[PDB]
């Protein structure tokens, strides 16, 4: 959990940047072989979110969730994770048109299995999007970025407190469930089959909220398998209670994939 800083080496250069700061390729020395890692460096509000983020990742063990090596307190605080070489799913699918829909069907199904696991563990992601999926190989996808994630209380199915990936009940009533993540996964799927395209192009959050309360949804992407588009619309059920959970979505994706 707490790593030695002399057994970790970084690059000078980063991979990307947000508000938290930089993400960097690095090399952690293990019992005897080195392992290639992605390290989230921090440029005490922000410090506390990181230790929370690592806390979520600590309790999660699934092949489709990014794996955490540990935390390193040195210089700046550092979250050290298993490296997923190909990186984000959107910038990739942007830069790789040739990727056949069967590949994308496989890739988003791995996510749904990942999210199914998360639902069963009663954790809410609250940030599920193409950008926050990473690729180990072209046929191995993992869910990343648990910075906004929450462990649900044993006695409730929602946390009470990015608008384009958010379920309507998240906007109006501030409630975040696995069902609201199912909505996000809907948008994630749209992005995937649109090859990394931004959802609701050139619309402000309130225009998106307007459209949805009219019972309108995003149009089917160019060349998207038809059954997969029906799934996006079911994922985007306005009513929380008739919207499917992740087991239900994972089932369809599996069934249609071997078809
Ligand atoms: C919390 C976190 N973990 N993590 C990460 C973990 C394991 N491997 C990798 N490998 C990896 C590999 C390549 C990457 C990137 C990341 C990024 Cl970021 C970019 C822009 N490229 C090109 N990255 C990346 C993040 C932050 N980003 C929010 C999403 O856009 C990803």
Catalytic status, residue 127:
yes
Contact between 123 and 60 under an 8 Å Cβ cutoff? The reply is yes
Beta carbons within 10 angstroms of residue 27's beta carbon: 16
Tokens found for residue 25: 């390729």
Domains of the chain: 1-83 (3.30.200.20), 84-259 (1.10.510.10)
The verdict on whether residue 19 carries a ligand-binding annotation is yes
Residues with CB under 6 A from ligand 1: 15-16, 23, 38, 40, 66, 81, 83-84, 87-88, 131-132, 134, 144-145
Name 72's bridge partners.
78
DSSP the chain: -B--STTEEE-SS-SEE-SS-EEEEEEEE-SSSEEEEEEEE---HHHHHHHHHHHHHHT---TTBPPEEEEEESSSEEEEEE--TTEEHHHHHHH-TT--HHHHHHHHHHHHHHHHHHHHTTEE-S--SGGGEEEEETTEEEE---TT-EEPPTT-S-EE--GGG--HHHHHH-EE-HHHHHHHHHHHHHHHHTTSPPSSTT--HHHHHHHHTTT--PPPPTT--HHHHHHHHHHT-SSTTTS--HHHHHHHHHHHHH-
- How many Å lie between the centroid of ligand 1 and the Cα of residue 85? 9
Euclidean distance between CA atoms 247 and 259, whole angstroms: 18
Euclidean distance between CA atoms 13 and 80, whole angstroms: 16
Q: What is the resolution of this structure in A?
A: 2.9
Beta carbons within 10 angstroms of residue 180's beta carbon: 25
The verdict on whether residue 20 carries a ligand-binding annotation is yes
Euclidean distance between CA atoms 145 and 160, whole angstroms: 20
């Amino acid at each position: 959990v707490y790593l030695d800083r002399k057994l970790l080496t970084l690059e000078d250069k980063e991979l990307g940047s947000g508000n938290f700061g930089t993400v960097k390729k690095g090399y952690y020395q293990m019992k005897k072989v080195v392992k290639t890692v992605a390290v989230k460096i921090l440029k005490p509000a922000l410090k506390d979110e990181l230790l929370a983020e690592a806390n979520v990742m600590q309790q999660l063990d699934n092949p489709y969730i990014v794996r955490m090596i540990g935390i390193c307190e040195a210089e700046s605080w550092m979250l050290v994770m298993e490296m997923a070489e190909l990186g984000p799913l959107n910038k990739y699918l942007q830069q790789n048109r040739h990727v056949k829909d069967k590949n994308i069907i496989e890739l988003v199904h791995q996510v749904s299995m990942g999210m199914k696991y998360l639902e069963e563990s009663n954790f809410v992601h609250r940030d599920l999007a193409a950008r926050n999926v990473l690729l180990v190989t072209q046929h191995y996808a993992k869910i990343s970025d648990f910075g906004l994630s929450k462990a649900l209380r044993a006695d409730e199915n929602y946390y009470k407190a990015p608008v384009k990936w958010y379920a309507p009940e998240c906007i109006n009533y501030y409630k975040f469930s696995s069902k609201s993540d199912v909505w996000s996964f809907g948008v994630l799927m749209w992005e995937a089959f649109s090859y990394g395209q931004k959802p609701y192009r050139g619309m402000k959050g309130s225009e998106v909220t307007a459209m949805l309360e009219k019972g309108e949804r995003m149009g089917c992407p160019a060349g998207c398998p038809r059954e997969m588009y029906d799934l996006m619309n079911l994922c985007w059920t306005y009513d929380v209670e008739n919207r499917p959970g992740f087991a239900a979505v994972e089932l369809r994706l599996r069934n249609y994939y071997y078809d």
